[PDB]
Ligand binder design. Structure first.
Ligand SMILES: CS(=O)(=O)N1CC(c2nc(N)ncc2-c2ccc(F)cc2)C1
Ligand SMILES: [Cl-]
Length: 350
């Protein structure tokens, strides 16, 4: 069995190409539609096809975003094509994406079942690359709005992390309100829990912080099946938000008091041997006030990631770390002066 379609490439000019794929497996499916795996007939490479029902009145926001994006820490849209087949007057948008075997979710859980934590070196590598991808998309004013371990793809050999699933992603314009029900359970910023509709891209930074803390703890940091339950687990760590903090998160005062608990020292949250810099980084990501959180780029420049800027740094398997320093002007526009930290001396050699 061999499907052949005429697809438009994700990047580059509109040059339609005959794409032929086989071994059409299935994997996940939910809020969008089905997701298949396949093998491309020529190159032999594996790819993931995300099929979704196409709306006639508007064009697909995921597609529109995916096409603008080109970055080595973000899944590549290789092609896209429209199809249907059988019952209904339904048009399906198919997104052909690079297949990436593992996810931070699966990896984290392997370590968690075996009562281990992921070696800090991998925490650094994975977290740094996430923050790069955030710095990039945020530079276009695009918020992902669903940062969680399941959406962080990993190549285990190269230690390369790629952000994926832009189904929730959106251009956040100041003054324009946005839906407050977007982020997944454990990774929602307090302002989202409080139902704020004037949130900024800092929600991604909170989410990322929840991933960091989770990789350090070996389990979700702010669990709970309700918002109430989540906010309690948060307050247990951060302490009770001041009236100031509360108005910063959500001006539309949903309106009620919380149990006055003081901040359980961040040091006592983690294992004894946990690097003090990792803890420091957490506390600067997981802040009540959206504007007080680090930017993605400021996070990349955090001391916690110093080891990665060492010229001698290698992966435990002996291979080189992936390219961490080739920042574009786009990536740096947030705050160009930071390049003095981000790009280390040995990366400037001619
Ligand atoms: C709908 S989705 O593409 O966002 N979702 C992520 C996941 C995925 N995406 C790509 N591009 N490549 C691989 C995978 C994936 C990885 C591990 C696994 F067990 C299942 C799917 C499927
Ligand atoms: Cl042509």
């Amino acid at each position: 069995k061999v499907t052949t379609v005429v697809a438009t490439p994700g990047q580059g000019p509109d040059r339609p190409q005959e794409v032929s794929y086989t071994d059409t497996k299935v994997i996940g499916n939910g809020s969008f539609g089905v997701v298949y795996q396949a093998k491309l007939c020529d190159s032999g490479e594996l790819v993931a096809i995300k099929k979704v029902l196409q709306d006639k009145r508007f064009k697909n926001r995921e597609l529109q975003i995916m096409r603008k994006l080109d970055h080595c820490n973000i899944v590549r849209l290789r092609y896209f094509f429209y199809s249907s087949g059988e019952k209904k007057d339904e048009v399906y948008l198919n997104l052909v994406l690079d297949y990436v075997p593992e996810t931070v979710y699966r990896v984290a859980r392997h370590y968690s079942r075996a009562k281990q934590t992921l070696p800090v070196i991998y925490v650094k590598l994975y977290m740094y690359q996430l923050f790069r991808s955030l710095a990039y998309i945020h530079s276009f004013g695009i918020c992902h709005r669903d940062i969680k371990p399941q959406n962080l793809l990993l190549d285990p050999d190269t230690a390369v992390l790629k952000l994926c699933d832009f189904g929730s992603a959106k251009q956040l314009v100041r003054g324009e309100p946005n839906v407050s029900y977007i982020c997944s359970r454990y990774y929602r910023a307090p302002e989202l829990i409080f139902g704020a509709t004037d949130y900024t891209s800092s929600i991604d930074v909170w989410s990322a912080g929840c991933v960091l803390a989770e990789l350090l703890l070996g389990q979700p940091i702010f669990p709970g099946d309700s918002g109430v339950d989540q906010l309690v687990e948060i307050i247990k760590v951060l302490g009770t938000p001041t009236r100031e903090q509360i108005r910063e998160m959500n001006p539309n005062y949903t309106e009620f008091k919380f149990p006055q608990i003081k901040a359980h020292p961040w040091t006592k949250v983690f294992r004894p041997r946990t690097p003090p810099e990792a803890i420091a980084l957490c506390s600067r990501l997981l802040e009540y006030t959206p504007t007080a959180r680090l930017t993605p780029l400021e996070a990349c420049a955090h001391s916690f990631f110093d080891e990665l800027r060492d010229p001698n740094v290698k992966l435990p398997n002996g291979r080189d770390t992936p390219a961490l320093f080739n920042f574009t002007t786009q990536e740096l526009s947030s705050n160009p002066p930071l390049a003095t930290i981000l790009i280390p001396p040995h990366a400037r050699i001619q």
